[PDB]
A paper describes a structure:
Among them, one gene codes for a [name] (EUGO) that displays significant sequence identity with VAO (≈40 %) and a similar but not fully overlapping pattern of substrate preferences. The overall structure of EUGO is highly similar to that of VAO, as indicated by a 1.1 Å rmsd for 490 Cα atom pairs (45 % sequence identity).
All these ligands bind with their aromatic moiety stacking against the pyrimidine ring of the flavin and the Cα atom of the aliphatic substituent lying right above the flavin N5 atom at a distance of 3.2 Å. In this orientation, the ligand 4‐hydroxy group is H‐bonded to Tyr91 and Tyr471 and is also in close contact with Arg472 (3.5 Å). Above all, inhibitor/product binding differs in a 180° flipped orientation. This can be visualized by superimposing the isoeugenol complexes of the two enzymes. In EUGO, the methoxy moiety is in close contact with Gly392, which replaces the Phe424 residue of VAO. This bulkier aromatic side chain of VAO likely creates steric hindrance, impeding the binding orientation found in EUGO. Conversely, the flipped isoeugenol bound to VAO positions the methoxy group in direct contact with a valine residue that is conserved in EUGO (Val166).
Numbering used by the authors:
A (entry chain A), B (entry chain B): 2 to 526
Write the structure that this text describes.
């Protein structure tokens, strides 16, 4: 049947659609079943249908966004804002609440408003992709570099709004976000920071402004539709060098992490955001599962050994980058070798030293860690047919015992539900994002349901061990928010109060981060 | 006459006081005229009496803070939270709204809850001063260092909650804040970030947690009473060196700033937060005004030259610190000399090369910039009798011309109101906090009034030129918030909406940052 917003009739939904067309143009509102297929989660989770959009609206400007918001308030139509809608692993462009209208800001609001070479910043609309900004920087012979996630087709803005991550020293996107413009849930427009001071030139210079600092409240949030965002850009260093350290054993995880911490916490000699990837992650990037194993169930030990040998990789593979004058690089690299060289079986390779298939990941990281966006990691989804992934993404202390515990816990369930567990620890100064990608066949109802049930188990079991997720998929948002229930669910109650105050009609992305406005609470969708 | 909360009778106040004594104990509620004299602003602004507390309550736990808040809500009594109450220049411990009860959290909530050597952080109650944490670190032979403002008697927490600043690489306090516990305006308690996850070890490891990120909303804010805060701590480097560069001309300001920017924006060779201080600031630190000029008006140029010559300082004096192995320090100092040595008249001194009176500020910065707290700068307040100061603190782009225009704009009004303009530019990566301290005799009603009128003029003039303040005094909060009125006052309306939703009875620090809850709006308070 036609997907309709909750509580809204065919007839009223038709009238609302026409008003959206009055604002944006007929070509810029999609509402047929065929046209909406493209906006389904590409990596669906759960057997049953879920996260169904009712329409897609593509506004050209902040004023059109305002008008759309006003219409949605009058009709009681929920709006789900995206930038580019490439949140794959977490839902793609699909709304948490079925029946919502997707507001695809990035389709037409895709301008680079300013790149300031002197002060090292950009001012962006939501449709500027990493590729788009890279092209700009290259075209203008900029001395600045961007910080990108693994896939360059996402949005500088949109990735930041979900507190996404990259891998240069500017890898904490939200840290470097400076100023934003947002349309609030009843249609009012607001600028944060120094941008609230008319005529200031400091909107991208000083993030805080005056008074309570609100920008974080627009991240992983349903408090508005963001229309402009600033971000600091790092100066490109004079030289760089990337390296891979292979570690032979699953059980080396503990020592790897413990040796890493003292080298990272001061931002030297580990200057970039290191990643520690398991052999499933690296093999999926360069090969299909049937190259190593075509039986049933989890891949046997002997098959794991063949991936390692054929690709010349370890069970754990550490990738980092160094920057600066050549002698600084050499000094740092020497320190890294000496430290991690304690682990029996450790082998080191720079980006100049390996040109082979297994080395493809190191070459990709050398691009990414130098702000050169890439789509090479899309190959991961060829690991099994109709491949998809979901991101289960607990936070870990930068402690080997903790990391090992988390690894063992996830691996036990992955094996039990027959899903391959590819791991990427993303290593900050004092924490790691432990990204667990389960790669699966999206066509098969039981695969999708095992994914859902396995990840619900892992959310709960992680939380019982004191671990929480940094980011999650539409299907897990209620379960993850339910783990952050210190003080009798104080955090969620606080969010809901602000939600209801700013969005009295319950319009913007209901259910994002488990935050449902009053009219939807307790309805279980 | 007895100071009472607004619309609260003598008897209703006496009843409240009793309820507060029941919670905290008799000794820990102050309510006599002369016990309250000590909580008046030490540097009063304006001729007329303002910012009068009705009582001070000193809780020993979060549970007590919750009960005090519940009592206040029942009675309609405003509560103005402070940590140590040393926000001198901006109000001291005094409340914005006369008749509020000061909640002096730090008197008895003064425990160092954790200092973690491995992960480099502290979890703190509000009463922990910089001197307290320093003593802890020294006693335990820690490898960590703290980051302090110029006066060590403040609160690690309280300073961060007003987005205050220090001078090491960790000098953006709010940037390094990681987790907090807050009592919300009806008495609910909440932990942010990973602290919301029961049993997490990552409260001080990963700041954002899950969902909308709220910690900024409790800074320069009246949304709660903070009871615990975490902060990252830097590893002490193996060596450090501080330096002074003196510049001879008032007109050198533009070139100093333009040369500085490329050396600062990448955190090297200017690793620390540089300060650029004028001769008035440095002379006040070491000498009284009457040493150089006796006369009620602006200091003549010949007296300025005498200050410079006797103290062997410039009109502009640049202070920085370098850290790391001794060869790194040498490369960076050499670069700094080569760049700033292009300004005619520039002279360079390390912390080993001055033992004279004018060198005293260098020695003090060498402490501060190494996380060694000091109160030597209290000498500034001896510039004139009964000395006080107010901070007029605009943000500047790191542009020489902008810094010069601000300098000239402020200097001109200072002349007109007969106040000396002491300047300290605090230089971030992409912005400067341009702190203007006006030092005056707090005992002369007319001087307190000129300070008020002058600074009201400066706020308006600066906003007409596109400059806003990062932080301000109780007397200026409304005027400063009024400058940030892009989009017909959008930012303030947003803040009011949240305030009213969290604080329906209008209890917590009414008027902080210009944010008044519903029962107080449109009033002359
Ligand atoms: C499958 C996968 C995913 C992945 C990755 C590797 C693989 C194989 N590596 C990643 C990495 O290195 N770092 C990282 O942060 N994420 C990584 N991913 C996940 C995903 O690809 C990316 O994060 C991607 O950049 C996110 O998608 P996009 O950038 O297109 O962002 P979006 O879908 O438009 O928005 C995400 C959410 O943010 C909120 N949002 C977005 N725009 C707005 C506006 N304008 N206003 C309000 N809120 C907005 C929404 O919640 C939206 O859903
Ligand atoms: C006169 C002066 C001041 C000064 C300075 C040099 C001189 C000569 N140099 C400074 C510097 O280098 N950096 C800096 O940040 N400030 C400097 N100042 C100003 C002042 O001395 C310090 O900032 C000082 O540390 C601040 O005072 P304190 O640390 O005691 O903090 P507070 O008065 O307790 O709190 C300030 C405000 O924060 C909010 N607050 C505080 N505690 C709470 C709790 N628990 N809950 C909610 N809000 C709280 C209040 O708004 C409070 O007024
Ligand atoms: C190789 C995968 C990287 C990744 C990093 C961070 C994420 O949140 C993520 O989500 C699917 C994926
Ligand atoms: C020497 C003055 C330092 C200072 C720095 C930052 C401030 O906000 C400030 O305010 C009174 C003072």
């Amino acid at each position: 049947t036609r997907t309709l917003p909750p509580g809204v009739s065919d007839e009223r939904f038709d009238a609302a659609l026409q008003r959206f067309r009055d604002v944006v143009g007929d070509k810029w509102v999609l509402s047929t079943a065929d046209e909406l297929e493209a906006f389904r989660d590409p990596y669906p989770v759960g057997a049953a249908e879920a996260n169904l959009p009712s329409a897609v609206v593509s506004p050209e400007s902040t004023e059109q966004v305002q008008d759309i918001v006003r219409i949605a308030n009058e009709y009681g139509i929920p709006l789900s804002p995206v930038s580019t809608g490439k949140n794959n692993g977490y839902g793609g462009a699909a709304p948490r609440l079925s029946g919502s209208v997707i507001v695809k800001t990035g389709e037409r609001m895709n301008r680079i408003l300013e790149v300031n070479e002197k002060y090292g910043y950009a001012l962006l609309e939501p449709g500027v992709t990493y590729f788009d900004l890279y092209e700009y920087l290259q075209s203008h012979d900029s001395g600045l570099m961007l910080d990108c996630p693994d896939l360059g087709w996402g949005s500088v803005v949109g990735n930041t709004l979900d507190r996404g991550v990259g891998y240069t020293p500017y890898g904490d996107h939200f840290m470097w976000q400076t100023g934003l413009e947002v349309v609030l849930p009843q249609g009012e427009v607001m600028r944060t920071g120094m941008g609230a001071l008319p005529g200031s030139d400091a909107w991208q210079l000083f993030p805080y402004g005056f008074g309570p600092f609100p920008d974080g409240m627009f991240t992983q949030s349903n408090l508005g539709i963001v229309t402009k965002m600033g971000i600091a850009l790092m100066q490109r260093p004079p030289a760089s060098q990337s390296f891979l350290i292979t570690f032979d054993k699953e059980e080396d995880l503990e020592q790897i992490v413990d040796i890493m911490l003292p080298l990272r916490i001061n931002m030297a000699p580990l200057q970039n955001v290191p990643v520690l990837r398991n052999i499933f992650m690296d093999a999926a990037a360069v090969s299909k599962r049937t190259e190593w194993f075509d039986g049933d169930g989890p891949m046997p030990a002997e098959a794991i050994e063949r991936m390692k040998k054929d690709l010349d990789l370890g069970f754990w593979n550490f990738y980092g980058t160094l920057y600066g004058p050549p002698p600084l690089i050499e000094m740092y690299y020497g320190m890294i070798k000496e430290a991690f060289g304690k682990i029996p079986g450790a082998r080191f390779f720079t980006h100049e030293e390996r040109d082979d298939r297994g080395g493809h990941v190191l070459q990709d990281r050398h691009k990414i860690n130098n702000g050169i966006p890439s789509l090479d990691e899309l190959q991961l989804l060829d690991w099994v047919p109709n491949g998809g992934h979901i991101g289960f993404s607990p936070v870990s202390a930068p402690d080997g015992r903790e990391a090992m515990k988390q690894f063992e816990m996830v691996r036990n369930r992955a094996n039990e539900y027959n899903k391959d567990y590819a791991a990427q620890f993303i290593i900050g100064l004092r924490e790691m994002h432990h990204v667990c990608l389960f790669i699966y066949d999206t066509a098969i109802p039981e695969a999708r349901e095992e994914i859902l049930q396995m990840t619900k188990v892992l959310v709960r079991e992680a939380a019982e061990a004191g671990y929480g997720e940094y980011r999650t998929h539409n299907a897990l948002m209620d379960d993850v928010m339910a783990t952050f229930n210190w003080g009798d669910g104080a955090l969620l109650k606080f969010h809901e109060k602000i939600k209801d105050a700013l969005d009295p009609n319950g319009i913007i992305a209901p259910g994002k981060s488990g935050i449902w406005s009053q009219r939807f609470r307790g309805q279980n969708l």
